[PDB]
Amino acid sequence: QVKLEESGLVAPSQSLSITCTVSGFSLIRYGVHWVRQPPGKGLEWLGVIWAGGSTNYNSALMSRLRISKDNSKSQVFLKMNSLQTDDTAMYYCARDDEGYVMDYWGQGTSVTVSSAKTTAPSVYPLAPGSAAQTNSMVTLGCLVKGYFPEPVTVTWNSGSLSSGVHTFPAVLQSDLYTLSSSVTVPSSTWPSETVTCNVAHPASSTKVDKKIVPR
Amino acid sequence: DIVLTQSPASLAASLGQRATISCRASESVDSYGNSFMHWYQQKPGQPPKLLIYLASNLESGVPARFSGSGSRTDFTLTIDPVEADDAATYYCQQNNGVPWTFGGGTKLEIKRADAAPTVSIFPPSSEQLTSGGASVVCFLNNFYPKDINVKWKIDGSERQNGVLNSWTDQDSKDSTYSMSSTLTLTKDEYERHNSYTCEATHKTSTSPIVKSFNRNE
Ligand SMILES: [Mg+2]
């Protein structure tokens, strides 16, 4: 209903371009805001293009930011230049109310500003230590290692296995991220039934499935 | 430009109790009998969601345990009674001038009974070893409070170099935290030791919780 599309990774020497495609309402009637959020930090308002087509902006960024739109295509555009690594952030677009609230939001698109190159992850299945099974519960793992930039998405059994899942925020080490996830199930679930971790890395256009097999 | 300052940076409230958080504006956000102050909730991995508009109006669909009050430069958001699903960060936002601006956010932690972690240790996968790498992973799951320490031992000797730790956000249903600790070594060094140990120190137990394995066929 509001959907952001963007490059994922941009070099600091280049420009950033993001498109917000809207549905279910018309840009002739509603304004659209841009808001960003660096990793672990707060929301920062970027600006707005009103229904009538005029714009207002974040004061500190106005010299390197512009917002425009195409009413007939239901698209709103953001462009930024003179990029900085602290432009790395989730970028959201949101519907105006005119001018009181942001009532519907897109899911956000991650933008990383960096000269490091895109790297697809290795995805490793983590089975328990070699042998039978000790407990009434079993915990399995999935290790997503050596990728860049953020994000990855991870599910278990295509998202049907969600209870008992813990997917941990990635850690950055020497220009590469590593992420892990655990899933805990009753002993009668595994290994008698298949458990697979599913990983997607949009920046490298890669998807990997790994079935957890006993050692 | 109007600057918003939120207080406290974080707070912890027990299930069923009352939370109130504050937003102070650098100058008045009032225009013709209305306060142009609004409140948003953001849950982990989600966009923000509008809760309260014009200081005290409940947005359609928002539960009635949420309320807002204030005028001029002083505003509050109140949740009473708090539920597990309210574990989130809350933002105030003003639009009495352009630019619109946000406060810096307040994180609400849900206080629950102490819970010991469930610890599991994982040797490197065959696939990682075949590739020339070796990571040992330890999960410390479903514990409270958030403070915890992990110590790694290799052949009985403490190892801190090469350990990466990561905490989840608070669980929206059971109010616990989990943490993953990954010891990454070269395959060369991994295959010159025999025993690998993850030790979890948490206020809930005496005994540190220890999980270990020996390298073997
Ligand atoms: Mg700020």
Residue numbers in the entry:
A (entry chain A): 3 to 99, 106 to 223
B (entry chain B): 1 to 217
Please quote the paper that reports this structure:
HHV-6B's unique gH/gL/gQ1/gQ2 complex (a tetramer expressed on the viral envelope) recognizes the cellular receptor, i.e., human CD134 (hCD134), which is essential for the entry of the virus into the host's cells. The immunization of mice with inactivated HHV-6B elicited neutralizing antibodies, and interestingly, most of the monoclonal antibodies (Mabs) with neutralizing potency target the tetramer. The anti-gQ1 Mab KH-1 and anti-gH Mab OHV-3 have neutralizing activity against HHV-6B, and we recently reported a humanization trial of these murine Mabs as candidate anti-HHV-6B antiviral agents. Herein, the Fab domains of the anti-gQ1 Mab KH-1 and those of the anti-gH Mab OHV-3 were prepared by papain digestion, and the crystal structures were determined.
The neutralizing potency against HHV-6B infection has also been shown for a Mab for gH, OHV-3. In contrast, the Fab domain of anti-gH Mab OHV-3 has a negatively charged electrostatic potential at the cleft due to the contribution of two glutamic acid residues (red). The residues 100–105 at the CDR-H3 were not determined due to the poor electron density (underline). The remaining surface is hydrophobic, with two tryptophan residues and one valine residue located near the negatively charged area as well. One tyrosine residue was also close to the center of the antigen binding site. However, the 3D reconstruction with 81,721 particles at 16.8 Å resolution revealed that the Fab density bound to the Stalk part, i.e., the gH/gL area of the tetramer which is consistent with the report that OHV-3 recognizes gH. We observed that anti-gH Mab OHV-3 binds at the stalk of the tetramer and at a site far from the expected hCD134 binding site, without preventing the binding of hCD134; this implies that anti-gH Mab OHV-3 may inhibit a tetramer function other than the receptor recognition; for example, the activation of the fusion protein gB at the membrane fusion step or the direct inhibition of the fusion function of gH. The epitope of the anti-gH Mab OHV-3 has been investigated by Takeda et al.. They revealed that anti-gH Mab OHV-3 recognizes the gH fragment (which consists of residues 272–422), and they identified an arginine residue at 389 as the critical epitope for the interaction. Moreover, the critical epitope Arg389 was placed at the base between the gH density and the Fab density.
